[PDB]
Amino acid sequence: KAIASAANPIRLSAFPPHRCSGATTSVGKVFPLSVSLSMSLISRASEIINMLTAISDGVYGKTYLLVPDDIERQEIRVFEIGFIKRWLNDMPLLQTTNYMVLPENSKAKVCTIAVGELTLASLCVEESTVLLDSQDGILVVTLGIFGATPMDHIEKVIPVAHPSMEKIHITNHRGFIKDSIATWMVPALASDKQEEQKGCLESACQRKTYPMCNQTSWEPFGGRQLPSYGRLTLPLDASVDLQLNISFTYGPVILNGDGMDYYESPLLNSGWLTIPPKNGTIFGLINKAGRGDQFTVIPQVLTFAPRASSGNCYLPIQTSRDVLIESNLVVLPTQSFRYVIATYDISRSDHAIVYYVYDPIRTISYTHPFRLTTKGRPDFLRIECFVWDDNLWCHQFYRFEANIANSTTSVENLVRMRFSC
Amino acid sequence: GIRKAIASAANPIRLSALSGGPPHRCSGATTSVGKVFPLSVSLSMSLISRASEIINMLTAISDGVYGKTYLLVPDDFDTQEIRVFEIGFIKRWLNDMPLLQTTNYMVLPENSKAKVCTIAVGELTLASLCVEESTVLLDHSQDGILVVTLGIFGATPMDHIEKVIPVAHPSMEKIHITNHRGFIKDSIATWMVPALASDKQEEQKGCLESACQRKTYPMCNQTSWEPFGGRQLPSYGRLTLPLDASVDLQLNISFTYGPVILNGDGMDYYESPLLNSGWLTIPPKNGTIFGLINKAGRGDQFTVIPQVLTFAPRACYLPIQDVLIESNLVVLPTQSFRYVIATYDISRDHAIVYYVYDPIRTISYTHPFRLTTKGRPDFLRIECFVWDDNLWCHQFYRFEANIANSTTSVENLVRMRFSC
Ligand SMILES: *[C@@H]1O[C@H](CO)[C@@H](O)[C@H](O)[C@H]1NC(C)=O
Ligand SMILES: *[C@@H]1O[C@H](CO)[C@@H](O)[C@H](O)[C@H]1NC(C)=O
C-alpha cells in the first residue's frame, strides 16, 4: 500500500534574486485561496496556537494547537498533511489530504514537525525539557499522505541517548525526512567537554567582552550550563519498532534555545541547522550540520559565529528597534546559498511583515514589507519558504493580540516576492 | 498492495465506515431544532469564502464519500466558466460533526465542452457525464458525451476523461441532460434523464387524453411538451456506465414509459432497499405542479413505476397540480421510505424550510432555517444523509441581493432534530 499510495501522487509532485546590483525593486503578493483545515478553522474565528509548518517535495505538513469552542470533550493537538497543487494562474494551492487529532492523555503540548516521502513526522512532549535521565519518553507521531495506513504511528518511545547527555529542550523545531529517516535538531546538555568549553569561552572573554560572560543563567537550561547541539534521529523502517537515537556535539555558542530548525542541503548527508534571532540582540545562525554517522556542527556564515583564536570554541557574538517579534531562519532550497527572516515591523504608518532575504556570500540583502490592514502586537511569527516557478514563496503564520480587542487573532497565508531592477 | 485500486481502498474504507448507526408519534405539537455547521475543508467552500461565484453546484453523498461538480467564474471566446469536480470524505470532527474534507479535485479545460454535467459518487469514485447542449441526439458534431471519472486520491487508473458515443436502444432520438444526481453501485454508475423515443407512444396519448376527459388540466391543451418541444411525450431514460477497467467505457442508454413527465428540467436517482432498483425523483415546478417519486429498475429490466405523488384518473399516472424557487426531491438513505424537499419561503426573515415526508405513518415534519441575508433566489439544491441517527442536508443556493449587482452563492450543512 505504501508504494501504491506513492505511485498516485507523483503527478502532484510536478533564480529568485537579481544577478547584479543597482536599484532593487521588490513586488509582493498574497494568495488567500487554500483548502487547508487550519485556514478553514481560522475563517470560523477559531484560535490556532503555535503552528509549525514544514514544506519539502511538493507535500506540506502542519502541526498546531486548537482552542475549542465551549468543548473540552484544554487545547487540542492537530496534525495536517497535503499537497501543493497548481491552481489557476499557476498559484500554489495547499490542499489537505489527511489530518489527525490527539486526545488529551497523549499530552502533546509541544510537538516538532517534519515532512518528506509522503509522510509527516513529529516528536511530542508535555514538558519542553526532557531528561535523559521513572524514564522520560517522547511521543512519536507519524501520519501518511492519505487515509489509514501502516504509515500512521502514535507511540511513546524511550530515547536512546549517548552517555552521558542529561537534557534536551524541545520547543519549535522543523526537521525533515530523507532516505526514510526523520531528523531534528534541538538544544542539548551533556557532561562531556562541558568544563573545557566554558573554560575556552572564559578564555575568550579575557580579550573581548560579550553579554554572556557575566550571565548567571544561560539560555535553554538555567544556571551556567553551556548548551550543545542535539541531533534527533528517527528511522521510519518497518523492520523493527521505532527508536529515537540522540547524538550531541558542540559548535557555535547557542544563545537562543527557543527554536532550532533543520533544512535539507544540496550536500548529501548534510543539512542546515538554523537558530532564529531573539530580542533584537541574538543574531540568527546558520550551521552545516551532519546527519550521518558523525555529528558535526560548523558555522556556514562566519561573521555571526567566528571561531576563537585560542582553543576549540567559538565566539558568542551578540549585541549590547521597531521589530516586536522576528523568526525564523529558513534556508532556501536553491543551489545558491540564501536564507530568509521575517519581522513584525511597526516603524511605518501601518504594521508590516517584512521579509529579509540574505545572500551572504556577495554580502547583499533584499527586503520587502507586507503591509497589514490590522494592527496589534504579536506573540508568535513563523515562516516556511519554498521556490515555485522561479519565485520565492513563503507560508507565514503569525498570532497577535489587537490593541482594541480582547482576544488573540491568528493569521495564515501564502506570500510571494519577486526582485528586479 | 499490488494494485492501487485495492490499496487506495484498504486505506479509506476504514474511514468511510466511520459513519455508523424520527420518533413514534407525539402528543401535541412536535418540536424541530435545527443547526448550521459552517466548518468545511472543501474546495467549493474555500472558493465561496473568497467571494468567488459558484454556479450550479450538484452534490452527491453516499457511503461517507461526497462528490461535487460546479462552475467556477474566475477573475482572469465566450464566457469563461470553469468546470470543477471535487471528491472527499465526511470525517467525524469534534462534537461528532460531519466535516467534508476534499481529498481530490480536478479542473477541466475549455476544449472539453462541459457546460452541463451530471454527478454520482460511490465505491470511492466520482462519475460524471458532461455535454454542452442539454439535448443529446442519438440519430443520424455527432453527439457524444464526455465521461469523467475521478478517483478518491491522486492520479489513478480510476481517473478517466473520455468522450464516448452512447449505445442506445433502437430507436431513441433524444435525451435531455440538465441537473441529475445518480449513484454508483456494483461498479456501475446510473443516471435517469428525460428521453424521447418513437416506440409505443399511442398507449400514453390514450391515457393522457382519458385523464382530462372528466376534468380540465393545463396539460390537455398542450400541443408541445416541455423537454423536446415536440408533440410526443417524454419517456424515462436510464444512463448506465460501467466503471470496470475490464472493458473500455461504453454508455448504455435504455428507455421506458411511466407516469407522465411534465418537468424535463431535472431527474435525480437515489439508491433503494429493493434489489437492482432505486428511487427516480422529478423536481416540482412553479405554482403547484409538484414533483413525483417513482421506483426505477437498475438491472437488466428497466421499469419506472410510480411510488408517491401521482394520481390515477381512469381505473398511466399523472402528477398533482410565498415560495419563490424550489427544486430537488431527495429520498433519504434509510430502510423506511422518507423524502425531503426544502423551499425558499418569504412568509416571515427569509427562510429555507425543509419538509420531510414519512408517508407510511402519514406524517410530515417541517423546519425553517431563517436567513441573516435577504434577496431573491436563482438556484436551490439539497443533498441529505443520516449522521448519528440525525437528519443532515448539504444545501447550496444562489440568490441575487437587493443591494448588489451580481449573484451571491451560499453553501453549508444543516441538521434537523425532531422531538416532543
Ligand atoms: C542510534 O543508535 C541505534 C542503536 O545503536 C542504532 O540503531 C542507530 O543506527 C544509531 N544511529 C546512528 C546515526 O548511529
Ligand atoms: C452495455 O452494452 C453492451 C452492448 O450493448 C452490453 O454487452 C452490456 O451488457 C450492457 N450493459 C448494461 C449494464 O447495459
Q: What is the CATH number of the domain that holds B326?
A: 2.120.10.10
Residues A162-166: contacts with CB within 8 Å, 24+ apart? A162/A190, A162/A246, A162/A247, A162/A248, A164/A190, A164/A191, A164/A192, A165/A132, A165/A189, A165/A190, A165/A191, A165/A230, A165/A246, A165/A248, A166/A131, A166/A132, A166/A133, A166/A190, A166/A191
Of B296, B293, B271, residue with least CA distance to B284: B293
Q: Residue B16: enclosing H or E segment and its boundaries?
A: helix B13-16
Residue A327 C-alpha, separation from nearest chain B C-alpha, in angstroms: 29
For residue A85, give the chain B residue with the closest CA: B105
Rounded-to-10 torsion of CA B339, B340, B341, B345:
140
Angstrom CA distances, B198 to B170, B173, B231, B343, stand at 9, 8, 11, 37
| Residue recorded with cell 440525525 | B390
Residue A149 lies in a domain: no
Q: How far, in Å, CA of A148 to CA of A80, rounded? A: 14
In 3D, which of A172, A123, A128 has the Cα closest to residue A325? Answer: A172
Residue with cell 480510476: B158
List residues bridging with B409 in a β-sheet.
B398
* Residue among A79, A146, A412 with most chain B CBs within 10 A, to mutate: A146
Contact B88, B101 (CB under 8 A): yes
Please report, as a single letter, which amino acid is at residue B8. S
Q: Tally Cβ neighbours within 10 Å of residue B52.
A: 15
Domain membership flag for residue A9: no
Pocket-testing residue among B238, B244, B250, B302, ligand 2, by greatest number of atoms within 8 A of Cβ: B250
Ligand 1 centroid, distance to B280 Cα (angstroms): 64
- Contact (Cβ atoms closer than 8 angstroms) between residue A325 and residue A380: yes
Q: How many domains does chain B have?
A: 1
Nearest by CB to A148, which of B2, B14, B82? B14
Report yes or no: A38 at the B interface, CB cutoff 8 Å: no
Quote the CA–CA distance of B296 and B199 in Å, as a whole number: 19
CA distance A414 to A62: 14
B9 backbone dihedrals φ, ψ, rounded to 5°: -105, -30
**What is the C-alpha to C-alpha distance for residues B263 and B329, in angstroms, rounded to an integer?**
13
- The answer to whether position A309 is within a domain reads yes
Asked if the bond preceding B49 is cis, omega within 30° of 0, the reply is no
DSSP H or E run through B47: helix B43-49
Domain of residue A228, residue span: 160-320
H-helix or E-strand containing B7? helix B4-10
Coil/strand/helix, residue A333: coil
Please indicate, yes or no, if residue B139 is contained in any of the structural domains.
Answer: yes
Q: Which long-range contacts (CB under 8 A, 24 or more apart) does A155-159 make?
A: A155/A241, A155/A242, A157/A242, A157/A243, A157/A244, A158/A244, A159/A130, A159/A132, A159/A232, A159/A244, A159/A245, A159/A246
Question: What are the chain B neighbours of A36 within 8 Å (beta carbons)?
Answer: 41
Domain assignment of residue A421, yes or no = no
Q: How far is CA A46 from CA A37, A71, A99, in A?
A: 11, 12, 17
- Count the neighbouring beta carbons within 10 Å of the beta carbon of residue A193: 17
Residue appearing with cell numbers 483548502? A35
Q: Please answer yes or no on whether B102 and A35 come within 8 Å at the CB atom.
A: yes
A92 to chain B, closest Cα gap in Å: 14
Which of A132, A158, A160 to mutate to test ligand 1, by most ligand atoms within 8 A of the CB atom? A160
Does the CB of B157 have a partner CB in chain A at under 8 Å? no
Q: What is the dihedral of CA A142, A115, A170, A224, to 10 degrees?
A: 140
* A97 in reach of chain B (CB within 8 A): yes
Is A147's CB within 8 Å of B15's CB? yes
**Which cell goes with A400?**
497577535
Q: Cα(B412)–Cα(B371) distance, rounded to whole angstroms?
A: 12
| B96, part of any domain | no
In whole angstroms, give the CA distance from residue A386 to residue A83: 13
Pairing of strands A160-161, A245-249: parallel
* Atom number of ligand 1 nearest to Cα A292: 13
Q: Is B213 left (phi over 0), alpha (psi -120 to 50) or beta?
A: alpha
Report the separation in Å between the CA atom of B33 and the middle of ligand 2, taken as the mean of its atom positions: 47
Q: Is A237 in the pocket of ligand 1 (CB under 6 A)?
A: no
Q: What is the resolution of this structure in A?
A: 3.1
C-alpha cell at B264: 424535463
Ligand 2, atom nearest to B188 Cα: 13
> How many C-beta neighbours within 10 Å does residue B92 have?
17
CA distance A409 to A380: 11
Number of H helices, E strands in chain A: 3, 28
Asked if the structure places residue B40 within a domain, the reply is: no
Nine-digit cell at A191?
557532561
How many helices (H) and strands (E) would you count in chain B? 4, 30
Contact A220, A257 (CB under 8 A): yes
Tell whether A152 is within 8 A of chain B (Cβ). no
Residue ID of nearest Cα to ligand 2 atom 3: B252
Dist CA A337 CA A353 (whole Å)? 23
B117: closest CA of chain A, how far (Å): 21
Ligand 1 atom 12: residue of nearest CA: A293
Q: Judge whether A31 is closer than 8 Å to chain B, CB to CB.
A: no
Other C-beta atoms closer than 10 Å to the C-beta of A245 total: 13
A233 lines ligand 1 (CB under 6 A): yes
Q: Which of A51, A175, A167 lies closest to A120, judged by CA?
A: A175
Contact A1 B14 (CB under 8 A): no
Run of H or E residues at B91: strand B82-92
Phi and psi, residue A200, nearest 5°: -65, -35
Asked whether residue A142 is assigned to any structural domain, the reply reads no
CB B237 within 8 A of CB B254: yes
The verdict on the CB of residue A245 being under 6 Å from ligand 1 is yes
